Amino acid sequence: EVNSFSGYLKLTDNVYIKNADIVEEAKKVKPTVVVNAANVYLKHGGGVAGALNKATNNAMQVESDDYIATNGPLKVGGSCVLSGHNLAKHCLHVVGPNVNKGEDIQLLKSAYENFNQHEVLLAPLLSAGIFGADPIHSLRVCVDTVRTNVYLAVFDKNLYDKLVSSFLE
């Protein structure tokens, strides 16, 4: 079956959320698009990007190095479409701002705007974790910006519960 997301809670008409590991969701669902929380040189060294690369047995990193050699780095707030390998038809590599490294939080709107070129996506919460954005603010920007159908996988029950409570205020 196509895009068989299960156990998500619908927040708005086009935003759904689950307490789940995006790598395990991608292997089960085989979505048309999985979003990677990338950096501008597509170096998948840890966190979500490192885990998605490891699940492709490093094929995503080799493909990413070839893209950067020909095209140069991405900009913060930008994206590129590459192969999904065994995880999806396509991977949309999106660069959210890293607030812990001084990047502008306003670019989080530009980052989520890349999702609107794809009808259905499996995604992480952009700029959260060690990128330093406030995760409740990242969910609000996602809900206000994305107009296509996005399934957010957030792999922490404590954070998932705080995000659903904040949305339902």
Ligand SMILES: CC(C)[C@H](Nc1ncnc2[nH]c(S(C)(=O)=O)cc12)c1ccc2c(c1)S(=O)(=O)CCC2
């Ligand atoms: C907030 C946090 C619970 C979330 N983590 C995750 N969310 C969803 N699926 C996950 N799998 C794994 S794993 C066990 O394969 O490493 C982690 C994970 C997350 C969301 C966004 C970002 C990060 C982390 S980061 O990697 O710190 C920096 C880039 C932006």
